[PDB]
Amino acid sequence: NHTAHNQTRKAHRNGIKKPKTYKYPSLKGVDPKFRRNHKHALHGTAKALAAAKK
Amino acid sequence: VNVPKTRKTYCKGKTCRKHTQHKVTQYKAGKASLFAQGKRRYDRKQSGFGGQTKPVFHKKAKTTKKVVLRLECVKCKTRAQLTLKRCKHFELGGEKK
Amino acid sequence: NTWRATVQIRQKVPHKRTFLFLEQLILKHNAHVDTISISEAKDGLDFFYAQKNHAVKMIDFLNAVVPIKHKKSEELISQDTTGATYKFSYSVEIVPICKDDLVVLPKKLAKSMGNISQFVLCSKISNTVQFMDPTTLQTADLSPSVYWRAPFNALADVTQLVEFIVLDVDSTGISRGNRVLADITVARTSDLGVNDQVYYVRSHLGGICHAGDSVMGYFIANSNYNSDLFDGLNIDYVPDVVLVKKLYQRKS
RNA sequence: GGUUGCGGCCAUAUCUACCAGAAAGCACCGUUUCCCGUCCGAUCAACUGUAGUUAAGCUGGUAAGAGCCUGACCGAGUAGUGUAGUGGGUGACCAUACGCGAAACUCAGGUGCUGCAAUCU
RNA sequence: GAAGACAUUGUCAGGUGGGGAGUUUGGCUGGGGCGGCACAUCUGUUAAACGAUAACGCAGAUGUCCUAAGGGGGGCUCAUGGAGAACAGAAAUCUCCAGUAGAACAAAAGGGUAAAAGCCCCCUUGAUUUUGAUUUUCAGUGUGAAUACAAACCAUGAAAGUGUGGCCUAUCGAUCCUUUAGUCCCUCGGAAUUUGAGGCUAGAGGUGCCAGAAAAGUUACCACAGGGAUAACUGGCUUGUG
RNA sequence: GUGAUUUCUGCCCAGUGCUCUGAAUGUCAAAGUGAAGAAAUUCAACCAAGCGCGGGUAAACGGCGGGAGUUAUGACU
RNA sequence: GUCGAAUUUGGGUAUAGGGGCGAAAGACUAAUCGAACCAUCUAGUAGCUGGUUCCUGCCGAAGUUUCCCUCAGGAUAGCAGAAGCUCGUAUCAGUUUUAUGAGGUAAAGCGAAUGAUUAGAGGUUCCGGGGUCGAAAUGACCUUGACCUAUUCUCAAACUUUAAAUAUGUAAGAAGUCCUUGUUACUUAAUUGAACGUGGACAUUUGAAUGAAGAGCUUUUAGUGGGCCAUUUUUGGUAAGCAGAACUGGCGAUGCGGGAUGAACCGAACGUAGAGUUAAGGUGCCGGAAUACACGCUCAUCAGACACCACAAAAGGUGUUAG
RNA sequence: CACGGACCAAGGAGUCUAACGUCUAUGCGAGUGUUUGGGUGUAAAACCCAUACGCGUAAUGAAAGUGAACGUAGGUUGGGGCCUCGCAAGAGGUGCACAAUCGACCGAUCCUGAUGUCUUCGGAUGGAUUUGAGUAAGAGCAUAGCUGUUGGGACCCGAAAG
């Protein structure tokens, strides 16, 4: 019926890699009240770095 | 079991956008209307070398019933439902508990 | 392998009423003599019978008192090598329809047995199953040869009975042996205290029913029935109350 | 240093028994019109700090007490266990090599510490 | 001669119809059959201190019950033991001291709970609307069950808060067709009006063999394609003493 | 269907079949009739045989037990 | 066996395939009958057997997960090959160390709670769970018993205060640390926080050890989806070359040296050759290699000789030896 | 001690086509495909060609329908290569593809309802933990090739039956 023999030796042929932890993680799942503010927070600071410091 | 005949429930209707008062009845079948699209290859291709086409149901361990609580709004009168459970009889109105 | 033949008795219903009737009747006539042992089951009990003929002799006793169905098989062991003698098993199934159920009969089946209405009670259960119309008294019998070719279920068990309180009894005056068709006026236990909602129903409980007296009954209105045979009825012909029996607290 | 208000860690702070507590503070106690709550102003409510009290509460001290908590070349490198051998034994199981390492018990010592605001012979 | 607008004959309709035709007659399995559900699930154990992990292993539960047994708030403390009170006693009501839960929490079992999640009262419907994200079984698909938010309207409380059903772990279901409830929205394709019919969006008819066929037997007259054998060795097994 | 002759052939019509110069209003198709509607349609009474109720039949299929009450009984109940 | 008749037979003639004919056997119908022969639809269908044609090179598996009237079969996931693509010390690893987490089996514990079991003696309104009965309810007849009533001692996979080993999660920095102050419609009594940043500082010991035949990524497709053996931990079964699991290695797919012989044990994994040293095993002779050395023990009228492995039990024996 | 093989020569089994997926080669490239047909010919060859049609340059909705630039077609983090500087190490500027992320535009669903208006039409502007096989200086079309899939007798031989 069921046995887990040879099942560890199969998975350790291609190894067990990590999900490689990108910069800028996705904000899907982060709180929507924070996402709605953080939309506008990046908008002003891109305008403020455009005209003032140049 | 029991549910009310009158019910104050939500409206999504370009004017109300709120909860108004609604009315309840049960589940009734009037003629199944074979302008429905699956009954004239019946009345086409039944009548054939090939014969009586469409299969029936027989494996009848089937049990339950469609139990309808409708919400007939006394204010706008159109059509989006509310649900019940797996339930077996349904009367409405009497036997408030 | 010392058992060598077996009767297997089962009744599918969770509250086995006819099966408990079987165990007290078998003790009375002392039919259990050739038992090796008695082993219980989930659904009934098992009888281990050493010789074959004693197992068959029980089934001749089982036909007389309870509606059954049976069949047999075999198993292979070790063949004494005089030319020869298999190990048999008898599977006896009681009809699950209890003594006091509510039953909606099939239409074609009810049309044969005296054209009784589809909505009847159970009556007596004997060798054959008996059905009684509670409103207008008329009896009809169902044999196991007729039942097992198209089996159905009971509509309600004992655990759906509702306490009522009789208000008064009016005898219409037609009867066979049960003081039949007493036009009983009756109300609920929960609603007699604070309500006036009164139910009005004929019943077979004619002579044994009095005013200010507690009866048990099937209540079709609030309770949740789900039969397809029930669904093909005419809902404005079904009675609201079916009066079943009486409690009658005798002594303390 | 002693009390009070609000706490943190939650018995080293509990439990049982007796014994002490100047000061201020808490407490017991006084009354029943209003607000309120009961069968009952006892709890709860209001009113007075006036008539009276440390008897309790609480705080502190003691007891070869029960309990709890830290320590141990205490138990004991014992039990158990990872790995090794063409090691032993008919077996049951036991030795040895490289490693990890307990517990109850025994004995010793301990019996609240402390943050903010305020008030006091 | 007889018979007569009936009979016969034609067409449709109901009954009867193994005399005949077609087809089916589940799976797992210390052989199949019988019994059983290990087929959808849940608790304790098997299980060898993450997780995972089998058996027709073991002790058991579920196909329900509930406008309160859901939500909020306030007050109060339980099983039992001891000492006292007309009838009154082994057990009525009342009283007091001791009382870490030995009680109760709709039900199996294991967790959880003492100014409560128990018990008794007070007001109530959040057991509501819109649809996304996540966890469990998992291919990281479905279904059921659950967790944390966002946008609305509310309930309770003086207030902080709590509430998106039962204190947690189980209590349930696709396509097809059916029908009802929201826009009174879209179309009926030569152009309109009114019935009728077909659509989108959310839900109940339900398959319990539970990722879901419409289905009784027998064959010793038997046929076809294949697959299993055959006995005499567990690890040394066998002998004379319950 | 039994299987020469001789000699006998008991009891039962509930069940399943079969049957009927038997009561009739329960069930009940198409067509037809009535009502409502603009019309398609919808609803209602009407309603043949058969089924159901009632009667007959075992040299038709078939069946021939148990509990008592005074302890062996072709006893009575 | 019968042999003067229900006798035997020639020719004529009739009945044809779901049809005929039968003094009944499912018999016979041209060596064919539980549905004849011939041609065609027909190369009928098959999860089931059998077979499948040249060489060399490189790489190289799986009998497991979920779902199916599914278990002799398929899809999906894994394992594998190929074609490669963007770059070239990337930051990863079947491992340790340090720093912290989690666990509740071994052992300990029972004069720190719980805790079975086997058997049960009587208790008519201290219950009534149920069964048949009954023109009723002062109602009978029954059974598991409602009750353990005043008993003791002993433990456990579903008992616990304490709690190893082995396995296991996370961290050991450039996407990081600090200083200065920009953004917002969220948050705060408050530009206070939060989140993301501008500008400035910090450099190769830039934050343990060791290694890296490059790291990262994507398409696409074959076969497989009947497994067995061993040590150790184990459940069912008295006990099985028995039935079912757990981690690792192997056989299957794999030769060679050793165990005489042997799919699984021991050594060791294969291009073609030469010299050298060894493994496991062995050195009387077969049979290459010491009838080498050294201390003892043992005599058998069935001695004994090397793990897996093909043999053995209790208990006796002035046989012998050392204690 | 499972099944087939007494010997030898000859014959003897993954083919063909319709529609397709990935990859590879070539032509042309916002286009591409002459060969249904016509013109010519040394004649089933070769050569030349119009008009359409196919697929592609636009999605989304069940539909009536509407239908893709706030901007150096955007901001940040990495990114080959080139440019500048330095003798070098390095520092600085620009940074294609491609990976991650926050936005903007179009369709769908729910909302917001301006100037107007045949008083019921019309849909300006603004939104949203939603939804799409999209836009965001196009890449496809045609022929051929191996491998793989489906329908065909479909790798060859085989039933009991109809």
Swiss-Prot record, chain A:
Location (main, coarse): cytoplasm
GO CC term (a single one): cytosolic large ribosomal subunit
One annotated GO biological process: cytoplasmic translation
InterPro entries noted in UniProt: Ribosomal_eL29
Crosslink feature (Glycyl lysine isopeptide (Lys-Gly) (interchain with G-Cter in ubiquitin)) location: 47
Basic residues composition bias: residue spans: 1-21
Family annotation (Gene3D superfamilies): 6.10.140.1730
Spans annotated as Disordered: 1-32
Keywords: Cytoplasm, Isopeptide bond, Ribonucleoprotein, Ribosomal protein, Ubl conjugation
Transmembrane segments: none
Cellular localisation: Cytoplasm
Superkingdom: Eukaryota
GO MF term set: structural constituent of ribosome
Miscellaneous section: Present with 51100 molecules/cell in log phase SD medium.
Family: Belongs to the eukaryotic ribosomal protein eL29 family.
Function: Component of the ribosome, a large ribonucleoprotein complex responsible for the synthesis of proteins in the cell. The small ribosomal subunit (SSU) binds messenger RNAs (mRNAs) and translates the encoded message by selecting cognate aminoacyl-transfer RNA (tRNA) molecules. The large subunit (LSU) contains the ribosomal catalytic site termed the peptidyl transferase center (PTC), which catalyzes the formation of peptide bonds, thereby polymerizing the amino acids delivered by tRNAs into a polypeptide chain.
Subunit comment: Component of the large ribosomal subunit (LSU). Mature yeast ribosomes consist of a small (40S) and a large (60S) subunit. The 40S small subunit contains 1 molecule of ribosomal RNA (18S rRNA) and 33 different proteins (encoded by 57 genes). The large 60S subunit contains 3 rRNA molecules (25S, 5.8S and 5S rRNA) and 46 different proteins (encoded by 81 genes).
Record-given protein name: Large ribosomal subunit protein eL29
Organism whose genome encodes this protein: Saccharomyces cerevisiae (strain ATCC 204508 / S288c)
Curated annotation (Swiss-Prot), chain B:
Major localization listed first in the record, in broad terms: cytoplasm
Cellular compartments annotated: Cytoplasm
Keywords in alphabetical order: Antibiotic resistance, Cycloheximide resistance, Cytoplasm, Methylation, Ribonucleoprotein, Ribosomal protein
Ribosomal protein listed as a keyword: yes
Coiled coil: none
Post-translational modification: In wild-type cells, 78% of L42 is monomethylated at both Lys-39 and Lys-54, and 22% are a mixture of species with either residue monomethylated.
Recorded GO CC terms: cytosol; cytosolic large ribosomal subunit
Function noted in UniProt: Component of the ribosome, a large ribonucleoprotein complex responsible for the synthesis of proteins in the cell. The small ribosomal subunit (SSU) binds messenger RNAs (mRNAs) and translates the encoded message by selecting cognate aminoacyl-transfer RNA (tRNA) molecules. The large subunit (LSU) contains the ribosomal catalytic site termed the peptidyl transferase center (PTC), which catalyzes the formation of peptide bonds, thereby polymerizing the amino acids delivered by tRNAs into a polypeptide chain.
Record-linked PANTHER family: 60S RIBOSOMAL PROTEIN L36A/L44
Note: Present with 13600 molecules/cell in log phase SD medium. There are 2 genes for eL42 in yeast.
Protein name: Large ribosomal subunit protein eL42A
Gene (name only): RPL42A
Curated annotation (Swiss-Prot), chain C:
Function: Acts as an adapter for the XPO1/CRM1-mediated export of the 60S ribosomal subunit. Unlikely to play a significant role in nonsense-mediated mRNA decay (NMD).
Organism the protein comes from: Saccharomyces cerevisiae (strain ATCC 204508 / S288c) (Baker's yeast)
Domain of life: Eukaryota
Note from the entry: Present with 11900 molecules/cell in log phase SD medium.
Locations listed in the record: Cytoplasm; Nucleus, Nucleoplasm
Family assignment from sequence similarity: Belongs to the NMD3 family.
Name the record gives this protein: 60S ribosomal export protein NMD3
Quaternary structure note: Associates with the 60S ribosomal subunit.
Positions of disulphide bridges: none
